[PDB]
Every structure is written in structure tokens, then in C-alpha cells.
């Protein structure tokens, strides 16, 4: 249902409207450069060097009987060297020969082939490829030997116990020189710090190095001989790729950093608040360094902002560090093991900036186009304003062009009951000119007083005025009332079509674009959970459950 029949009037007073002339453009972020440098948490255990001392006592049972010899007993007695004579094994590498042993007041002496109380030399033995370096001193009967061994060791993070590469575990901190409350659980009196006496590393025997201090703990069987250090040699932080050309952005809640080479983008929690380190004191030397250098090679483009190197902490746990630039004229952290969370953020950030600038314009180009559309809407009003004011407003209105403003009014409806039409376009005075439009007759609402007037375009009727043209030869033309058309051949209602199925013109530029369809993602995987367990060359769960199957035969019967 469209707008119905109506009649308009009142050129005098309505409301007032004026065409605008100065429509502006109501259009719709800052960023600093930087030199960031990021650290991750450390997992590598701490290491050092070590050297062990031991001395063997053997008891091998040889039997000389009647039928056959009985090669039976194999006895190991590794014995520990006292403190006051180890040093000769290090200086010119000479080894003591006899064993001196006391037991419960008694004293026993076991010489080695009527041995001497004076020392003997040694010789390096064979060994495995990149294995353990070890030197020996020999090339029920009794024989003995000394042994020295050189190897590596490693310990875990919160300093409970350190374990060598062979299995001689011993519960003590590697940083304990007395009078320092660290973790320590050995019994008593097994410590010595003989201050600055040197060890020579078997290439020569005469050179004198600095020779920092050394501890001499023995359990009772084997003497460990590492060298101690102060407890700033294990920083709990480690290095990573340092970028060069980042750019920062502060919006709303927190900051975003965006690099461009490693195409990542980190994100932090607080807003400005510079956290300061507490026990990360080792790493400040490396970062007071090497910020320069990266400052140095871009000297002709930027200046410093301030000396204050600031720190941050991100969500997954990676402490940052960076200093701002400007253009010029002329405990622990415990990070979470994954990539692809500092990676995905690029795919959502660097797609945001591209789409937003594309929608940056076309808000500009749409505005500039509408200024030119406004001007065309002025000159149409000077032709016939009663048509063009209707479509812009929304309903059937009327106006009558007073001066340089528009004269909006309100029309009165007419009853839908009885409409008429005239059967002849001829003026009923003579054989002269004719009307051009089919004048009709009508009546008001609820009063039944009938009038007549002229039907105009778009089923609007104004009264008390005619219009005509000169009659001529035969040329038909159509008209269009409510929901139908009907043809005049020359001056008669010759036909009535009553179908609005005559072909239209179809002027509509179809912006026929698309939607965005929703594909789903599969779940692929590069290295299965089962496959990781078979990666080790040893079968730890195969050895032990086989060893206690042929060793339950001690209970024979």
C-alpha cells in the first residue's frame, strides 16, 4: 500500500527549511621508536671442574692346591690420602707408595714389594674418546696403587646437592666456605681452605700461576678438589634475539610492542610502571653494555631520550628492556613453554592496521561525493519542488517556493470510496484545443459535497486550474492512476490494461560482492607423544625389571 489520494493547499504559513551550504567532513595513535632487547628464563644447569683422589688396597686370593687353583676372592679397598701430602701429587706429580693404616688402636703396614717411604712417579693411561682424563701410578697376595682422576660435574638450581659424572653424590652446596647460611648437611670437620697454593696442569711443572683457593673435602674414601667462587656466577637469565627497528604503541589498558624482522609482537600487563630487579643483579652489566652499540650506528638520525633504561614484565614471562628515541633535525620467572602466542598477535595486529586505513578512506571519499550530491538537489527545486521534497522527507508533503526557502505544508486525505474519470479529453466548448490531463471529479469525507478538478502526476490532484495544448492528428499516450494504467487512443478510454507487468527499465547497480565463508581447522601434529618416549637410546624401563628376575635365585631352596 502506497500513499493514497490527497489535496494540498496553504501557500501562506507552514514550517521553514533552508538548504545548508557549508557541510564539513566529520571524520573518524601516536608512536615512538625504540631499541628493545628481550630475555627468556634459563634452564641450563651450572657446571665447573673437579678432580678426585683415591688409593687402592687389593686382596686377591690365589690358591696353590692339588687338583686345580682356586681363583676366588676379588677385594677392593679404596683408601683416602691424608691432607698434608696431597700437594706433591700436584706440583711435580709424584705419588706416595706405602699405606699407613690405623684401626681401633692397632696399626698395620702393608708395603709394596719391600716398599720405600719415599715417593714414585706416574704415567697417563689410556682412555675413551672425549671421556675422562685419569692418571695411574703402577705399570692372598698384596699389591696397591694410587689413582687420580679429572672430570666434570653439574648441579641443579636451588643448590641442594651436586652430582658428578660417575655417581659419587654428596649432599652439600657448591658455595659454602663457612660463616654463610647456605644449605649444608655433611657431619663435621671435613673442610679445608688452604689459601692460594697452586696446581700445575701437567704440561709443565715449574710455572707459577695466581692459584685461587681450593677445598679438600673427602667423605673418607675419595677426595674431591674443586675451586670455589663467589655466588655471582649463575645468572638466572639468558640472551635472545635483539631487534633493531621496533615501534611502540600505548592504547587504553596496556602497551603493545611490534617488531618487523622476527615478525613478533609482545604485550605487557601494567601501564607505565617500571619494575626494578631484585636478585637479577648480574645482568645489569651486559645491558649497560651493548645498548650503546645499537645506539651508535644510528647516530645521525636520533638522539637520546633519557638515560633511564626501563624494564617490564610480560604475561608469559619474558623481561624486556628498551630506551626511547626521537627524530632529530640537522626467586625466578617461570616462563610457559610455547611459541605461537607472541606470534599470533602479529596476525591480528598487522591485519588490523591494514583494514583500518582502507576504511580510513572511503569515509573520506564518501563525504566528498555527498557534497556534490547536495548541489544537484538545489537546482531540481527551481523546476518543480512538490516532487523532490517528498522523497527526501519520507511521506507525501507539499511546498510552494517562497523566496529562497521552502514552504513545507500538510495535505488533507480524501475518501477512498468514489473516484471518477472523464471519458473525453475534449474541451466542451467547440472543436478547438483539448486538455492534456484527464480531469476528474471527487468528493470530501463525511460531508458528501462533490467537486471536480484535474489529476496530476503521482496520484496528486490540485483543483481550480487547467492546462491545455493544441489539438493535432492521432497520437496516443498513457496515464497512470492507482494500481493501473489505461490508454487513450485519441479522446476516449479506448482500453484498460490493468497489468503492471509491462517491462520496467531496471536501473540498479548491483553491489553484488560476497560474504566470508567459515572454514574449520584440522589438528595436525609433528612429533607424537609415543614417539618422544622411544627417542632415548637406553631403555630405562627395560633394565631394572629384567635385573630383578634372574637375581631372585639367591633363595634357591
Amino acid at each position, epitope marked *: 500500500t502506497s500513499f493514497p489520494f490527497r489535496v494540498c493547499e496553504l501557500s501562506s504559513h507552514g514550517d521553514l527549511f533552508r538548504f545548508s551550504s557549508d557541510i564539513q567532513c566529520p571524520s573518524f595513535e601516536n608512536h615512538t621508536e625504540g631499541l628493545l632487547m628481550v630475555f627468556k628464563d634459563n634452564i641450563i644447569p651450572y657446571s665447573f671442574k673437579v678432580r678426585s683422589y683415591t688409593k687402592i688396597v687389593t686382596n686377591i686370593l690365589i690358591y696353590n692346591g692339588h687338583r686345580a687353583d682356586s681363583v676366588t676372592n676379588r677385594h677392593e679397598e679404596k683408601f683416602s690420602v691424608e691432607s698434608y701430602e696431597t700437594d706433591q701429587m700436584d706440583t711435580i706429580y709424584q705419588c706416595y707408595n706405602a699405606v699407613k693404616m690405623t684401626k681401633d688402636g692397632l696399626t698395620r703396614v702393608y708395603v709394596d714389594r719391600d716398599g720405600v717411604n719415599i715417593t714414585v712417579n706416574l704415567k697417563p693411561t689410556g682412555g675413551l674418546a672425549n671421556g675422562v682424563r685419569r692418571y695411574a701410578s703402577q705399570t692372598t697376595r698384596t699389591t696397591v696403587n694410587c689413582l687420580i682422576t679429572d672430570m666434570m660435574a653439574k648441579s641443579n638450581s636451588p643448590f641442594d646437592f651436586f652430582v658428578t659424572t660417575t655417581g659419587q653424590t654428596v649432599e652439600m652446596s657448591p658455595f659454602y666456605d663457612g660463616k654463610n647460611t647456605e644449605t649444608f648437611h655433611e657431619r663435621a670437620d671435613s673442610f679445608h681452605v688452604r689459601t692460594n697454593y697452586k696446581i700445575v696442569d701437567y704440561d709443565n711443572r715449574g710455572t707459577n700461576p695466581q692459584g685461587e683457593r681450593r677445598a679438600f673435602l673427602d667423605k673418607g674414601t675419595y677426595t674431591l678438589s674443586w675451586k670455589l667462587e663467589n655466588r655471582t656466577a649463575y645468572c638466572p637469565l639468558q640472551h635472545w634475539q635483539t631487534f633493531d627497528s621496533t615501534i611502540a604503541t600505548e592504547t587504553g589498558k596496556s602497551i603493545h610492542f611490534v617488531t618487523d624482522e622476527g615478525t613478533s609482537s609482545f604485550v605487557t600487563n601494567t601501564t607505565v610502571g617500571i619494575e626494578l630487579p631484585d636478585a637479577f643483579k648480574c645482568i645489569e652489566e651486559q645491558v649497560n653494555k651493548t645498548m650503546h*652499540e645499537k645506539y*651508535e*650506528a644510528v647516530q*645521525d638520525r636520533y638522539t*637520546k631520550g633519557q*638515560e633511564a633504561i626501563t624494564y617490564f614484565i610480560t604475561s608469559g614471562g619474558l623481561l624486556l628492556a628498551w630506551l626511547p628515541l626521537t627524530p632529530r633535525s*640537522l626467586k625466578s620467572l617461570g616462563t610457559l613453554n610455547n611459541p605461537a602466542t607472541v606470534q599470533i598477535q602479529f596476525a591480528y595486529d598487522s591485519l588490523r592496521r591494514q583494514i583500518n586505513r582502507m576504511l580510513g578512506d572511503l569515509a573520506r571519499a564518501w563525504c566528498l561525493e555527498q557534497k556534490r550530491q547536495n548541489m544537484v538537489l538545489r537546482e531540481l527545486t527551481k523546476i518543480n519542488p512538490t516532487t523532490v521534497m517528498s522523497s527526501i522527507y519520507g511521506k507525501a508533503v507539499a511546498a510552494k517556493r517562497l523566496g529562497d526557502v521552502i514552504s513545507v505544508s500538510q495535505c488533507v486525505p480524501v475518501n477512498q470510496a468514489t473516484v471518477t474519470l472523464r471519458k473525453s479529453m475534449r474541451v466542451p466548448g467547440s472543436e478547438t484545443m483539448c486538455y492534456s490531463r484527464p480531469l476528474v471529479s471527487f468528493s470530501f469525507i463525511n460531508d458528501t459535497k462533490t467537486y471536480e478538478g484535474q489529476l496530476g502526476t503521482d496520484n496528486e490532484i490540485f483543483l481550480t486550474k487547467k492546462m491545455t495544448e493544441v489539438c493535432q492528428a492521432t497520437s496516443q499516450y498513457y496515464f497512470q492512476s492507482g494500481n493501473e494504467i489505461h490508454v487513450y487512443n485519441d479522446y476516449h478510454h479506448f482500453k484498460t490494461i490493468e497489468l503492471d507487468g509491462i517491462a520496467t527499465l531496471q536501473t540498479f547497480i548491483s553491489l553484488n560482492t560476497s560474504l566470508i565463508e567459515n572454514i574449520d581447522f584440522a589438528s595436525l601434529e609433528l612429533y607424537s607423544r609415543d614417539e618422544q618416549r622411544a627417542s632415548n637410546v637406553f631403555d630405562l624401563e627395560g633394565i631394572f625389571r629384567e635385573y630383578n628376575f634372574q637375581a631372585q635365585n639367591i633363595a634357591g631352596l
Partner: antibody
Amino acid sequence: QSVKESGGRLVTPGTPLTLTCTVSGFSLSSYAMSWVRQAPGKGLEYIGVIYASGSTYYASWAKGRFTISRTATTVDLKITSPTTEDTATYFCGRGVSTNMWGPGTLV
Amino acid sequence: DLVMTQTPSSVSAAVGGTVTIKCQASQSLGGGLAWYQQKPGQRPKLLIYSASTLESGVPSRFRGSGSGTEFTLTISDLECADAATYYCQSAYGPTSNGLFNAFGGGTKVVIK
């Protein structure tokens, strides 16, 4: 890493002598290098710089006396018009600070 | 270009003492400068950059401070092996009226 020096001989003042060496250790494309000279009796004097963007600059006393150019693996120095009391010794920078100088050489 | 000012050509006291090699310049410098030290015949070697910190390897006997124009150097404990000439170097990069990076003069100590 270090860098080296090649030159000397103390040729006649008619020679347009060249003075080059720069070797290895690291990428040359993203740092800075600089020349500096020592003379007996006196101290030292800053010569020139070359920055990572590719431009060069020169000091405030020898504004046409020298020229520096990067060869993407080596950098050099050309002296235009020698005289009899300017040339004593020369160096090799590796930045503006933080010693990576090396042995140097004598004219 | 401005010229450095490197006045006091002092002498040492006995070992285990203090000296002061304070120098200055004649412009608004900005960020920081440097301080080298070299024995006769060899390459240079630096100690302090940006008037603030030491470097790894050189012990903590030296220090330094100051901001703007005047800049103070203080050695302590005076081991006799360390006695040579000292210097100063500005590092500020190009701006208006040319460069700002040149050495200044010379100052040596004499061990007693």
C-alpha cells in the same frame, strides 16, 4: 675479532698515496668505524667517521684533506696532498668507543 | 668547533693516595664523554664511557661523575704500575655548526 692495517714506506710528497685494510670477524654492514692519528711530541686528533646508513662526515680541521669510502668488505683512506710534518701514525676504529683498535701502523 | 680544557698537569703522591684530573669543556655537551689511558708505544684503551660506569676487566678503583660541562675524574689507591698520560673524548654526533667529537690535549702523571 680484530682488523688490520696495510701501508707505510714514507714515499715522496708527489705520491697520491692510498692507505687501506679491513678484514673480518663480524658483519661490517651494521656498525661504525673511524680513523684517528697519533704524532710524536703531541697527542691525537680525530679524523673521520662513517655511519651505518651510508653517509660520511669529516672533522673540523681537515675539511678537504682526506676522503673515506666503504667497499662493503673493506674501508680505506686516500690522502690528497702529503707534506713533510703531518704524517706520523694511523689507527683503525671499530666504533666511536669501546676498544677494538688493534696494532695500528706507521706512515 | 669548541676546544677542550684539560688544565692540571699534576704529579702523583705516594702509593695509596688520591689524585684529581678534573677537566671541562666550553659548550653544552649533553649525554656523556669518555676517558682513555695508554702506555707509551701501544694501542689506546678505555675505562669510562658516558661519564657513568666502569667496564668489565678494569678494577673498581676508578670512578667518575659530573653532568653538563664540568666532569671530574678520581683515581684511588695509586698502584705504581698504572702511570701514563690520560685524555678525554666527546661523543655527540653531528648537529648544527659541524661535528662535536675530538680529543683534547694531554695530561700525564709522574709516579713518585
